[PDB]
Structures are given as C-alpha cells and as structure tokens.
C-alpha cells in the first residue's frame, strides 16, 4: 500500500550499501526486497572461497576497508580477518543491516516491475509494493554460464573438500579457475587447466597458487584452447575444442566460466540488454524507464567494469545526490564531502583510468 | 657548492615519497642524503618480516596501494605480492627512485645541520651541501630501545631460522613481538611472551598466530608484567619484573621493545625533543628552525601516530604546497586535486578520527 520513496531489489553487497548511503543523504523511506536472506550469494560461495581483495581498517585516514560497503564499517574491524569467507561476508552485511535498521523483506522474489501513474509497482511472490525510485541490485550469481552438456560450475560447489583426491580439469583461467586449481591441488589432486593468464591474477591468488606449486603440486595449464562441448561416454568425460585434439577425463570438469546478468527477468524488463551488455546512462540509469537505476558488480561502462566492491560502492553517493536533486532538496554538502574524502564519490569515470608508472 | 632548494635527510619510505611529491609540485632541485643505500632500514628487517598492511593495486579507483609512497606506484603492481618483505620494499623504493630520476647520494652520513645567511648548511662524512628547505626523514630503526643488560632486539635478528628449535622468551606484546612468537613457533619452538594485547593486533598477524596455535603451537602469554632487568648467571638468563617472581630461561630473550627517534643527533639539533616526543607545529615544522620539517613514521601529533606508510605519506603534498606558497608560486590546483582524490592530502588531523560503528 505505502507509496515508498525507494525500493532496492536485492539485499546483497550493493543493496545494503545503497540503503545505508540513501540514509546518509536523508532518504529513509527505503525498502529492500530479497529473494533469500541478506547476503544470499555470499552464503552460496564454495566454503573455501575468500575475497582476493584484502580487508584492513584504514577507515580513519581516507579509505575504508576495501570490502566494506559503507564508510564507517569494516569486515577487518568486526571479524579480524583479511581475506573474508562468503559466510563471514553475509554476516558482515547482516551486522551492518541490523545496526543501521534497514527495512528489509527477506524471502520475497520480485517477479515484475511496471510503471503506474504516481510510482512504480513491484509484484512479488509475497505481496505488492510501490516506489518512486528503483535500484536494481540483483547481481548475477544465480545465472552462471553453463554452455555445455556437462560441467560443474564453480558457483555450485559447496566445498572443494568433498572432491576425492584425483584428476580434475578446470575450464577458465581467471580468479575462480585458479582458486579451484589451488583448492583441489592443496588436497593432493592433479589439475589440468584450460584457458581462453597468471599476469592478470591478484597477488593473493598468485601467491597461494605459487606456493602449492613450489611445493610440488601438479597444476598444468593449456593456454590457447576454447571448449566446444563436453560429453560423457565409455565411462568418461570428453572435452572437444575448436582447434585441437579432444581430451578425456574421469570426473566431471569444473567450469570457472562467469555469469550473465541479462538472464535476469527484472533486468530484461527494465533495461536494453543488447548483447550480454546492460545499456545504462552515464548516471547508471535505465535508458527505458526513468528513476530506475542499476547498482553493483554488474555495472560495466567500458570505462570501468565495476566488478569489485571498492569500485561499485563509489557510485552509491553519486546516485543518492542525483535523487535528492530530482526531489528538489538542497545538496547535502557535508555528506557529499565525506564520501569524496573517503574515495566513495566516483562522479567522473575519466579518472578511473588505472595505470602505474613502474 | 650549489644552493639547493631542498635537502631530504634519509632515502627511506618518507624521503623517496617526499622527493616524488616535490617533483609533482614543480620542485625538482632536491637532493636526498642517505647513510646506507635506498631503503636501508627495510634491508635490515629480519628476513621473514612482512608488512602487516596488504598491498593491492586499487590505484585507479581512489586509493593507491597502501604500501606505495606515491600515487602512481604499487608494490603489488611491480612484485605481485600482498605482504611485502623488507628486501622487496627496498627494491620497490629503488625502482621508483630510478624511474623518477631522484638525485640521491648514498653512503653519506649527515652529521650536522646549521643555519647560514641565505640557506642551511649540511655537514656530512662525504662533502658539505646547502639547501633552503630541509626534510628530516631519518626514522628511528637504528635507535632500538635496549633498556636491559641483555636481550636481542627484534631489529637485529637477520633470520629467525638461525635460532635452533627450543625455548624462547619474547618481551613486548605488539606486532613485532607476536611476529617473533609466530616465526619461532612455526619452526617448532615453545614461546613465552611477556607484555605491558591480541585485540590491537592486525588481521594478518592475528590470523597467522591463530593458525599455528590452532595447529598446537605452544605460545603462551603473560599479560601484566613489566621487565625490570635481564641478567645472565649460573648458565642462564634471569628476567626480573616490577611486580612478580623472577623467571629463568636458557637462551637470550628477544626484545620487541620499540625505537626512539629523539636519540638521533640530527633530531636533537633541529627540534625540541622534550620527552621521547618531537615537538612540531601543525605543519610538521620544527619549532626551533623555520623551513625544517619532519616526515615519516616518527611524526606523532596525539591526534594521530602516523606510523604507517598510508598515514605519513598523506602529509607529503600538504608540505609541498606550503613550500610552493612560501616561494611565492601559484597554487598547483591540478596537483592538489589529484592528491586529495587519492587520499593523499591530510590537511586536517580532526578527520583522521578512526572509529567504526560496527
Ligand atoms: C566467487 C566470487 C568471488 C568474489 N570475490 C570478490 C572479492 O575478492 N572482492 C570484491 O570486491 N568482489 C568480489 N566478488 C565480486 C562482487 O563483489 C560480488 O559478486 C558481489 O556479490 C556483488 O554484489 P552485488 O550486490 O552486486 O550482488 P549479490 O551479492 O549477488 O546480490 C544480489 C542479491 O539480489 C538477490 N536477488 C536476485 N534476484 C532477485 C529478485 N528477483 N528478487 C529479490 N532478490 C533478488 C539475490 O538473492 C542476491 O542476494 C566476488 C564474486 C564471486 C562470484
Ligand atoms: C619491523 C617493522 C615492520 C613494519 N611494518 C609496516 C607495515 O606493515 N606497514 C606500514 O605502513 N609500515 C610498517 N612499518 C612502519 C614504517 O612504515 C617503517 O618504519 C618505515 O621504515 C618508515 O619509513 P621512514 O622513511 O620514516 O624511515 P626509514 O625507512 O627508517 O628511513 C630512514 C632513512 O634515513 C637514513 N638515515 C638515518 N640517519 C641518517 C643520517 N644521519 N644521514 C643520512 N641518512 C640517515 C637511514 O639509513 C634510513 O634509510 C614497519 C616498521 C618496522 C620497524
């Protein structure tokens, strides 16, 4: 019934962060609608997965803990950990949501959003809600890319310890693929990795991988290979490539293949989704519906992929301000200045240009 | 002979960083005078010591790698490491010094600085130099606190592996003391730690310490003890405390006791050094001599201890600007704005107030 100012779809990193930022800009009539519980995606990381980005409570001197979604919070503070488990990060989001008294509705699958006269109407599996501004914060963890007949996606592994010691193949040479190799190899398995790469790799994964290898771990990498299909016959898996002889392997291959936000129905209803790409204005706004915005790790602008918390969280306050100006309210320059001083006001993508001189 | 604009005493983290920042503000007639080689202190860390602060190349999106001493550099970039060895950090400072073409004079022990009419005169063991502005960047690693008859200071250990497996005592329950315990315990020794503390500890050291302990390591901590003296008699070391029965131990105790910058002759000549405290103006300037400043980890203001790279490096550009204004040159607002945007313009200590809400 209520004519809410804001509805945020999804109570993940981006939705919780955005709700806190909106509060700082004086916007409190905000509901968050979540299909599972706060931090759903993080709770479904494999058990051993840790953030590659390290948490340190540098919050006082100009940059908040890189994994924090608000200026005054820090997983390193709450948990005394540097590399955070998904389970711990879910709890971080719960601790922060409880503290800032966010109005969140769990176990509510948003099914349809449409325009009415005075607001947007939000159909869910629970009840209907209404709001002026919508922040689509739905991510993509539930839409992993599974292009072949077989293969276990990284996102569907509960615990790499459940795999018996043996011979495994990993497809995708990225952060998750090398993590998969490292998790399996640390338990004594032999891994073959096929990739479309160690040069793009974060220090955390690079050092962990290098240490098990330096200690004799058997991890091999084949570097100019693209998988055509995976089939199962004659008691084993057969990986066929575009250019190259097929390969056979005893256990199901692990796919570190990525995800696709355009597969989300809500994204399809609210944005132009031309080609696995979500079209947004320079203010992260839908080009179809006004006052509908996209937030989180799925925001790409080909001036920045925004896939890290420390990147996508810098947009929150830029949108909160825009919202206050469209509402005819004065600019909250005390607040805008805190965000700017703490690296959380990315208003110009021209200066996201990341490159070191040596 | 030359009437230099600037002389920086010390080519450590702070001296190299300050020279690069001065260059960005258009001040290039800068000499750096170093008693050893670039990064001398780091080269004399114990071999196993790593920065507790993690390096990640976040440089593009508003905060440079926390261990970097300039905006456009990153040990994570150059070395693909997160927790940096002292040896690697020395090389980082050398790579950056070579790239920015700093004018550095190694193996030059500065012995005396005094006022002349048109500039300051700098007596060294090599030759005499002259400069308008002096940045005292001498640190304190060579003045460890050794208050007892015996004890091996943490800073004088080359390699914790050289200690035979056995029974050790560590005095001081801080980052270095817990590192000492962890290094010895990981090689199977039993450690007794005496402290004036795990709550102040960084995530990196907390997790490493907790892991060896969880794996059965024998590390014990006695928490309300102050060492009076250490003596050696009857084949062993005797630790006597203010309040408490003495203790006896077979090997020389390891002191994680800290350092004292006021023991440096150059600091004594240029600052009021009342009580292990160095008196500075709100612009890090000497209260005795104008245009003489203190930079680095030794700058404390009881509004901030500035003992971390990410803290003390934020003062560089504030001083560089002050210098340009005293020179009657226009404010370089392009530069001032880069520094401000990258968390490296700490002009007001009132906002160094570090405290998380949860
Ligand atoms: C394995 C892995 C490791 C990562 N490691 C790092 C790291 O080291 N550092 C870093 O900065 N980032 C990391 N990330 C990247 C990024 O931070 C995460 O993807 C993060 O989850 C992005 O946050 P989000 O809010 O955009 O999405 P999510 O956290 O996925 O939140 C989306 C939420 O919306 C909900 N939802 C979806 N559809 C609906 C609907 N129809 N109705 C209601 N609710 C819905 C979901 O249940 C979910 O909780 C990692 C990601 C992955 C997958
Ligand atoms: C063991 C240890 C671990 C640390 N870990 C971290 C970390 O995790 N993260 C972090 O941010 N900081 C860390 N630090 C804190 C701080 O960053 C270091 O102390 C750092 O060395 C400070 O840099 P500096 O330039 O002020 O001093 P220094 O690096 O010590 O530089 C001073 C230089 O001046 C030279 N010098 C001294 N006297 C003279 C003279 N008379 N004439 C010419 N040259 C002279 C010296 O040779 C030396 O090279 C750590 C420090 C120690 C001791």
Swiss-Prot record, chains A, B:
Listed EC numbers: 1.-.-.-
Pfam families: Pyr_redox_3
Keywords noted in UniProt: FAD, Flavoprotein, Monooxygenase, NADP, Oxidoreductase
Gene Ontology MF terms: flavin adenine dinucleotide binding; monooxygenase activity
Reported cofactor(s): FAD
Catalytic EC class: oxidoreductase
Known function: FAD-binding protein that may have monooxygenase activity using NADPH and/or NADH as an electron donor.
The protein's name in its UniProt record: Putative flavoprotein monooxygenase
Species this protein is from: Staphylococcus aureus (strain Mu50 / ATCC 700699)
